[PDB]
Amino acid sequence: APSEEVSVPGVLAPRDDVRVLKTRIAKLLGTSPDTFPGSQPVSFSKKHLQALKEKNYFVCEKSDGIRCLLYMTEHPRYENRPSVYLFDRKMNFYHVEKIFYPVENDKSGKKYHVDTLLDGELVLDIYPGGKKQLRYLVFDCLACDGIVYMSRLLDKRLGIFAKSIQKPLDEYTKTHMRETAIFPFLTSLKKMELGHGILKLFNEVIPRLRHGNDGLIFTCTETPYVSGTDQSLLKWKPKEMNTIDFMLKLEFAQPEEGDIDYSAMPEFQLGVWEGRNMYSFFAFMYVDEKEWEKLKSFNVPLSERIVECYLDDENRWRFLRFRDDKRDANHISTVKSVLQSIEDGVSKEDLLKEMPIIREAYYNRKKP
């Protein structure tokens, strides 16, 4: 019976704290306090294949987890108290107690970072023995130690973070084992390849990951950091990632004579939630005999329940897992949106075929 992660380590901060934080960040970056300063990517379409040939790009595995900005500052209440806050795109602030970030070449160990805004993702790695480890992967930096690098390019944005934050953290980590083992998570820089290193991610990086994955991310290294939707930031996903939740109904045809043989394969009808109580027939869920005997091996009710399905390479929906939590299937709007996402976007093949050209075009515009 297939069914079903990571969560923010901190605890929700009080309103009179998050308002002060919002104001402080707003004054630092020069944006609206309630407006999320982070960036959001766009769907990778065909027109981007040309884009990768006209600009320098960085590609990295798009891990699945919680995207949230990290903020090193002083506690809103107490005057001098080093504090770290994680906040998502919905502006929900979480105070991460029990964590610090060493300053470069700090003999005393009392120095701490302020006005430091990092852009990263929260993932959950699986180590040998089933032992889990929460991790924070940094892929950008909006501000560091009081300086706003949003006007700068990616190499400098990651460079300053590498020098003033990551390196002292590693230096501290390699000497202090037990101290590091108390951290709510391990902060590390995300492994990134060149825009044409796609293949390397497919055959080496991704299959050796310790956490989940859904597609790739292309980050332009020739563009400044942009709050909100970024045209240079591209999110690519193969067809199998676009999953839709349907209502499953097993239709056993009425036999010519005798009682219905349920051992025989029925029609797996998938329905979409339209109204509030009204569903509508959408498509069929393809199941072969091995998979059918597999379904009867669960010995659970199959009909009348939510299921998660994906489009295979043959453009037919296959069973993935049950959705015991979902009250209703995906609304017709969501279904339409996903169908549009599948209709658009570049295939893995047509994306790979363009790599040798992107590589040479990159080495061609290269600075001597």
Partner: peptide, 4 residues
Amino acid sequence: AWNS
């Protein structure tokens, strides 16, 4: 037993 549904629409469409």
